Amino acid sequence: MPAIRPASKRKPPPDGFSDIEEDLLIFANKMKDAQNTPTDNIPKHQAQWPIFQIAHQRSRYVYELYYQKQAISKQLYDWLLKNGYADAMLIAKWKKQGYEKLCCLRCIQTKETNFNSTCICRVPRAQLKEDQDIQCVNCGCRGCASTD
RNA sequence: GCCCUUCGGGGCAUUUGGUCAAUUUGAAACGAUACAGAGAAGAUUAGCAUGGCCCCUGCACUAAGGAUGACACGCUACUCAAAGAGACGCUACCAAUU
Ligand SMILES: [Zn+2]
Ligand SMILES: [Zn+2]
Ligand SMILES: [Zn+2]
């Protein structure tokens, strides 16, 4: 379970976890530092942006470690997705076509916008104004479209 | 970026949003202090209401309480006369002790 077991109850992870544990702990400590970041000098949605950034990065590490540069077994990959080292739904969207670089699921959630739209970060920057710096309110993405 | 191609081309995906993170000048309120100071025609007071540009506590916007919760207590011509009886009214002002 992803609930914390005592120690004697703890089952070992699969093989290769000793090989990837250092990068996984790098992402975990990055996430704790994002928890401890100050919020006085920035706005509030901007305070929540780094969690989405680090979650995307951790899931991308797992995703391209399994699919692109094959370095982990399928047992280990399924274990990582089950135990919370990567976002299975974000990885599913990365497998979809036209969503190969999606920042977050909240940015394609169309039931939650005013006019049932995706966010502006999903729009190909070829159709936007020049020097129109987008940083979306949801995660601060500057451009996710696969063409971008 | 990926995919397809008859290598000319075509496809997949499509417009977020919370006035800034900044406290003097776009609106918080007690308490302390100062002061005064509790209804019903003598004195003392159980209350229940009434009306709303007065509200408070309460789930009660179909209880109850808040001094009977308070407020009430100033002010005061205006649909408006008639009868009969008066008026040096409406003008003048005036000549003997012995
Ligand atoms: Zn996003
Ligand atoms: Zn976005
Ligand atoms: Zn994005």
Beta-carbon contacts of residue A19 (< 8 Å; ≥ 6 apart): A71
Question: Which chain B positions come under 7 Å from a protein C-beta?
Answer: 1-3, 11-18, 20-21
For A46-108, the DSSP string reads HHHHHHHHHHHHHHHHHHHHHTTS--S-HHHHHHHHHHTSS-HHHHHHHHSTT-TT---GGGT
Rounded, the Å distance between the CA of A81 and C1' of B65 is 62
- Residue position matching structure tokens 């049932």: A116
Closest CA to A57 of A23, A82, A13: A23
Integer Cα distance of A96 and A54 in angstroms? 21
Determine if residue A102 is labeled as part of a ligand binding site: no
- Contacts from A25-28 at CB under 8 Å and sequence distance 24+? A27/A54, A27/A57, A27/A58, A27/A61, A27/A85
Beta-carbon contacts of residue A23 (< 8 Å; ≥ 6 apart): A61
Check if the beta carbon of residue A84 is closer than 8 Å to that of residue A24: no
Kindly determine whether the C-beta of residue A124 is less than 7 Å away from any atom of nucleic acid strand B.
Answer: yes
Q: Is the dihedral of CA A88, A95, A77, A18 positive or negative?
A: negative
- How far apart are the CA of A93 and the centre of ligand 1, in A? 12
Determine if residue A91 is labeled as part of a ligand binding site: no
- How far apart are the CA of A140 and the centre of ligand 1, in A? 7
Check if the beta carbon of residue A94 is closer than 8 Å to that of residue A126: no
